[PDB]
Design a binder for this molecule. Structure first.
Ligand SMILES: Nc1ncnc2c1ncn2[C@@H]1O[C@H](COP(=O)(O)OP(=O)(O)O)[C@@H](O)[C@H]1O
Ligand SMILES: Nc1ncnc2c1ncn2[C@@H]1O[C@H](COP(=O)(O)OP(=O)(O)O)[C@@H](O)[C@H]1O
Ligand SMILES: [Mg+2]
Ligand SMILES: [Mg+2]
Lengths: 244, 92, 121, 30, 11
């Protein structure tokens, strides 16, 4: 053993595990993480299966399980910062103030899905940054304009070479919070291969609480995420999406 | 009928020829390894492009993340090709 | 309209690229394909920045009125937005690029057929 | 002209080192 | 330099 080369690569287990110290991992995710860590310890480090397992564990231990941004519930300064950036638009400001008040009454962070539609150049896309600043929520934007590949919303199975979880999980890893602000622009101009059937799994309070991704294959709770969708005209959005 | 045995002996001779071919391949590669590339040289090859560029912080984080896994994978994996080609576009 | 674009680039000493969007129908030409797909390449704009070796070239988008249907018109909205160019997202890179320094010149024979979201931008 | 003998010797040394490493690994596994 | 080229050609 001394003559042959030996390396203490077993430290990778606690290298992954330290990421969960400040997280609140649900039991079903923690079980999968434990099984994957047990599998990794047996694979030779040169194996392709070892690399796939390592990437899967890296994605699993980077999701901010239980992390929440410190939402600002102060009505006065939230209104002040909303009037700071945009003039007019009474309805949207009132909606945001009502959202803050309702979140303050129930004593917990709340998730909602709002759609802004109107003539071009009225400030639907720009206000998303102001709302994020008012709520202190992390902000993220991706456009579904011309979206014809479902893999952007749901990702690809990790069996394939170089699979990635997709836009939503990338956002969750980037913002490091489970309650960011999602701006989905041009929701009324989504294409077909059918991504319109994938958004229904995302923009639905009845099923987004256990959003299932093709790569992770473990449900995540997106019910507290605030979704904002921008459209030019309402009569072209799919009916199931307009319903929710 | 020892014809099958003679054929097996010819197959063993072919296996010995394959062994000699492997030895000759190693001999050729001994000199062919000059002026080639490796997993360590490619890292500085990608990093030298970033020397004269004002790279934003997020792009730097992505590049560091890809280089970190670059040294872990072997030189022949398909995922190694994928990440190498991704970095070739990202650092250019 | 097409010839003046090269003269403007020569006067400004900017790098020049010609993008003939007229008749195009594949959205993947603008926003590329994911890394997972074999043989994937970024969109045309990323190759423009790569070949011109500058972040502020002159991009000539010829025949915006002749774009196809059945839809790159919605993909252009993330490319011709006066303030969203700072975070243009290509599916291959999966990294926002700052296109606010790029001078976009668009050619159209008739105004009435350009969609309102593009005609107002 | 004579560089062939040096190249062959270096290649033989490298192959011998690789085979010694393989034999040591096999002995360790046993 | 020619010796290395000669060896490469022979290989
Ligand atoms: N009520 C407003 N007050 C101040 N500026 C505004 C207002 N509405 C729109 N704008 C300006 O318009 C620009 C772009 O608006 P945008 O969000 O793209 O509109 P739309 O969502 O209709 O495309 C922003 O830079 C913003 O400054
Ligand atoms: N103002 C001008 N001065 C000199 N030549 C011109 C002028 N306008 C157009 N031309 C000539 O017309 C030819 C084709 O013009 P083109 O750029 O195709 O026009 P458009 O873009 O309207 O189709 C060019 O080769 C150019 O030499
Ligand atoms: Mg807008
Ligand atoms: Mg012309």
């Amino acid at each position: 053993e001394l003559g042959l080369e030996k390396d203490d690569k077993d430290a990778i287990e606690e290298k992954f595990r330290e990421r969960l110290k400040e997280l609140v991992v649900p039991k079903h995710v923690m079980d999968v993480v434990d099984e994957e860590l047990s599998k990794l310890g047996l694979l030779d480090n040169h194996s392709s299966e070892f690399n796939v397992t390592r990437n899967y564990l890296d994605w699993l231990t980077s999701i901010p399980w239980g992390k929440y941004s410190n939402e600002n519930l102060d009505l006065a300064r939230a209104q002040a910062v909303l009037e700071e950036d945009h003039y007019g638009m009474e309805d949207v400001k009132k909606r945001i103030l009502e959202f803050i008040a309702v979140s303050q009454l129930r004593g917990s962070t709340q998730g909602k899905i709002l759609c802004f539609y109107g003539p071009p150049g009225v400030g639907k896309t720009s206000i998303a940054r102001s709302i994020a600043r008012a709520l202190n929520r992390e902000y993220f934007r991706f456009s579904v304009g011309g979206m014809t590949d479902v893999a952007e919303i749901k990702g690809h199975r990790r069996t394939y070479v170089g699979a990635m979880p997709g836009k939503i999980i990338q956002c969750l890893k980037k913002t490091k919070t489970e309650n960011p602000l999602i701006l989905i622009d041009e929701v009324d101009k989504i294409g077909r291969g059918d991504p319109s059937s994938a958004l229904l799994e995302l923009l639905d309070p009845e099923q987004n609480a256990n959003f299932l991704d093709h790569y992770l294959d473990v449900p995540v709770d997106l019910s507290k995420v605030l979704f904002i969708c921008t459209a030019n005209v309402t009569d072209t959005i799919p009916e199931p999406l307009r319903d929710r | 009928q020892q014809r099958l045995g003679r054929e097996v002996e010819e197959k063993i001779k072919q296996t010995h020829r394959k062994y000699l071919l492997q030895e000759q391949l190693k001999i050729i590669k001994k000199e062919l390894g000059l002026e080639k590339d490796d997993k360590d040289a490619i890292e500085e090859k990608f990093r030298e492009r970033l020397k004269e560029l004002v790279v934003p912080k997020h792009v730097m984080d992505v590049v560091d993340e890809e280089l970190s896994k670059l040294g872990l994978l072997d030189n022949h994996s398909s995922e190694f090709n994928v990440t190498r080609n991704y970095l070739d576009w990202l650092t250019s």
